[PDB]
Amino acid sequence: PPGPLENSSAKLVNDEAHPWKPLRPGDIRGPCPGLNTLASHGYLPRNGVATPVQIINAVQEGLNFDNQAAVFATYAAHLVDGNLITDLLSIGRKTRLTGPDPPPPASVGGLNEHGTFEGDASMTRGDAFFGNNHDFNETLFEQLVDYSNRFGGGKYNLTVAGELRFKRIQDSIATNPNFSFVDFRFFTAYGETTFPANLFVDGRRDDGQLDMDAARSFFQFSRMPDDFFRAPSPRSGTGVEVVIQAHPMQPGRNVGKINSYTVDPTSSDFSTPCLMYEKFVNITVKSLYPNPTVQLRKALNTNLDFFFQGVAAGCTQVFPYGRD
């Protein structure tokens, strides 16, 4: 697992060695505009299948994503969505490129796999319930623009993030009878809304105000603006507290029908990051791998260790298969 950038100042990353290209048939793109754009500028394999080490070097070098967040997000995703023997992860749909599957109920389903990492009330993608959880959706993007106009002076910023995050949750509650918003997804849904203001903003300026042309380029086409400079120093979810505090929300879920959102008092929330860590490892990962062979157990323990090092709140390490 790579350490932080050696030299992490702003610099042009839309450069000569990293041109955008269109998708070839077979090139895999998914629900993350950050990984998508990196793949499309060749910071990641252009076909969208990568090792964890590759994804981490790419997000730091391409966009100056900080090391702790890159390590948390990448090994969390690899544990639930990736192939632990081959050490590969698809950034979108399940693919044979990741090699021979483990036994069920592990899915190795790529970032597109619903319920594991990816989840509901995304900004520019529709819920899995309605059929397609990974393609750019134009109606939701035009909503992001609207809110930018109304709260951001035409630009996306943390204030807009706060408003739209809530709007999307409300939208899901009213329309999605499967709406779920607990645990891992509750956590990551709020930190994602800060990323575009933090990281899609040209680094020479770095003033957290994202223009709509830049926003469309990343979200829709996986493409950096012309002459794009990365952020002037490493960061990820700075300001998430702005987005949480705008519209206080307790973790919960619709119960088999629309508008039935019911708080779940067993879910972690922001005051309990280590319950969220423990349930991810001790319930989510453990249920995908309830009885691993010696070889799989050893791959699981190595990735669980690397995952534990990226956990922002620190926490106490949990061992689903033992320390041995």
Ligand X SMILES: *[C@@H]1O[C@H](CO)[C@@H](O[C@@H]2O[C@H](CO)[C@@H](O)[C@H](O)[C@H]2NC(C)=O)[C@H](O)[C@H]1NC(C)=O
Ligand Y SMILES: OC[C@H]1O[C@@H](O)[C@@H](O)[C@@H](O)[C@@H]1O
Ligand Z SMILES: *[C@@H]1O[C@H](CO)[C@@H](O[C@@H]2O[C@H](CO)[C@@H](O[C@@H]3O[C@H](CO[C@H]4O[C@H](CO)[C@@H](O)[C@H](O)[C@@H]4O)[C@@H](O)[C@H](O[C@H]4O[C@H](CO)[C@@H](O)[C@H](O)[C@@H]4O)[C@@H]3O)[C@H](O)[C@H]2NC(C)=O)[C@H](O)[C@H]1NC(C)=O
Ligand U SMILES: *[C@@H]1O[C@H](CO)[C@@H](O[C@@H]2O[C@H](CO)[C@@H](O[C@@H]3O[C@H](CO[C@H]4O[C@H](CO[C@H]5O[C@H](CO)[C@@H](O)[C@H](O)[C@@H]5O[C@H]5O[C@H](CO)[C@@H](O)[C@H](O)[C@@H]5O)[C@@H](O)[C@H](O[C@H]5O[C@H](CO)[C@@H](O)[C@H](O)[C@@H]5O)[C@@H]4O)[C@@H](O)[C@H](O[C@H]4O[C@H](CO)[C@@H](O)[C@H](O)[C@@H]4O)[C@@H]3O)[C@H](O)[C@H]2NC(C)=O)[C@H](O)[C@H]1NC(C)=O
Ligand V SMILES: *[C@@H]1O[C@H](CO)[C@@H](O[C@@H]2O[C@H](CO)[C@@H](O[C@@H]3O[C@H](CO)[C@@H](O)[C@H](O)[C@@H]3O)[C@H](O)[C@H]2NC(C)=O)[C@H](O)[C@H]1NC(C)=O
Binding-site annotation: residue ranges for heme: 32
Q: Is 52 in the site for ligand Y (CB under 6 A)?
A: yes
Q: Is 220 in the site for ligand V (CB under 6 A)?
A: no
Q: Is 152 in the site for ligand Z (CB under 6 A)?
A: yes
Q: Is 73 in the site for ligand HEM (CB under 6 A)?
A: yes
Q: How far apart are CA 28 and CA 213, in angstroms?
A: 24
Q: Which two tokens stand for residue 261?
A: 């959102």
Toward ligand Z, which CB reaches closer, 179 or 186? 186
Q: Where are the alpha helices (DSSP H) in the chain?
A: 33-40, 52-63, 67-81, 138-151, 158-175, 183-192, 195-199, 212-221, 240-246, 273-279, 286-288, 294-309
CA dihedral 294, 297, 298, 304 (to 10 degrees): -170
Radius of gyration of the chain (CA): 19
Residue tagged 């061992």 (tokens)? 319
Q: Which two tokens stand for residue 278?
A: 């423990």
The residues pairing with 235 across neighbouring beta strands, listed in sequence order, are 65
**Residues between 106 and 165 that touch ligand HEM (CB under 6 A):** 111, 117-119, 122-125
How many residues at the interface with ligand V, by CB under 6 A?
8
Contact, 139 vs 186, CB < 8 A?
Answer: no
Distance of CA 269 to the CA centre of its chain: 18
Q: Is 132 in the site for ligand NAG (CB under 6 A)?
A: no
Stretch that binds ligand X, among 16-24, 75-83, 227-235, 269-277 (CB under 6 A): 269-277
Q: Which of ligand HEM, a second copy, ligand Y, none sits in contact with 9, Cβ below 5 to 8 A by type?
A: a second copy
Binding site listing: 32
Stretch that binds ligand Z, among 116-124, 274-282, 287-295, 297-305 (CB under 6 A): 274-282
Q: Is 81 in the site for ligand Y (CB under 6 A)?
A: no
How many residues at the interface with ligand Y, by CB under 6 A?
11
In a 3-state reduction of DSSP, which class is residue 8?
A: coil
In the complex, what is the shortest distance from the CB of residue 308 to ligand V, in angstroms, rounded to a whole number? 29
Summarize as ranges the residues that interact with ligand V (CB under 6 A): 126, 128-129, 132, 137, 139-140, 178
Summarize as ranges the residues that interact with ligand X (CB under 6 A): 103, 129, 151-153, 157-159, 178, 208, 273-275, 278-279, 282, 290-291, 313-316, 318-320
